[PDB]
Design a protein around this ligand. Structure first.
Ligand SMILES: NC(=[NH2+])c1ccsc1
Length: 223
């Protein structure tokens, strides 16, 4: 997260870190046994880490649970990042509490102008690299589809939305992918892609979760 703020320990209780020896992506806990992330985060050997604040320190609220399976969206295209969504099942159910908690799926798609909370452990620099070890947060509005398509000609599908600031300076970044965009208490986006980070006229692009609620619910019900 570039240009954000330190969330505070365990203030984003649905935020997870996906670990394969090291943190590589975020995710969102949507029930005691399932996480939503980005399809481009797929890899073998994922451990889901819940209750984290500093990802390099065991502070006392963590649960580390290996994935039993992952399900990349059937229509994910890794070249265009269309349908950049996957589901990860935990081998055992997490113990839910005030600091490890699921986030609700949306009932309706959120509108341009709505404020959202974007979070992650990714790079905090638009030029160069610095990883923060504690969770960073950014409040950002959803941008209009027209301004999103104008920013990224030929690249925005109906399964993506832009959020952030066209002036630059505040954005998600590398290492935040797969993490949450929460608006009015519902998971509306997944950190997906952007050109650089926090660049002028290059806002963050996010997977449009509301398009996937039926697929998420049906997949969970049979897996
Ligand atoms: N600029 C962004 N929002 C971004 C997201 C993942 S990598 C870069």
């Amino acid at each position: 997260i570039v240009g954000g703020y330190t969330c505070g320990a365990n203030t984003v209780p649905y935020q997870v870190s996906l670990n394969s020896g090291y943190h590589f992506c975020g995710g969102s806990l949507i029930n005691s046994q399932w996480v939503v992330s980005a399809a481009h985060c797929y890899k073998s050997g994922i451990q889901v880490r819940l209750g984290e604040d500093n990802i390099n320190v065991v502070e006392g609220n963590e649960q580390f649970i290996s994935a039993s399976k992952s399900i990349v969206h059937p229509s994910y295209n890794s070249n265009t990042l269309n349908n950049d969504i996957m589901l990860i099942k935990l081998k055992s159910a997490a113990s839910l509490n005030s600091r490890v908690a699921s986030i609700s799926l949306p009932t309706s798609c959120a509108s341009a102008g709505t404020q959202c909370l974007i979070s992650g452990w990714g790079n905090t620099k638009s030029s160069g690299t610095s990883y923060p070890d504690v969770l960073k947060c950014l409040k950002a509005p959803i941008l209009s589809d027209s301004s999103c398509k104008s920013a990224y000609p030929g690249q925005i599908t109906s399964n993506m939305f832009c959020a952030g600031y066209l002036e630059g300076g505040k954005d998600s970044c590398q290492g935040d992918s797969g993490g949450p965009v929460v608006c009015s208490g519902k998971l509306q986006g997944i950190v997906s892609w952007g050109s650089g980070c926090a660049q002028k006229n290059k806002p963050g692009v996010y997977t449009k979760v509301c398009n996937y609620v039926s697929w998420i619910k049906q997949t969970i019900a049979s897996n």
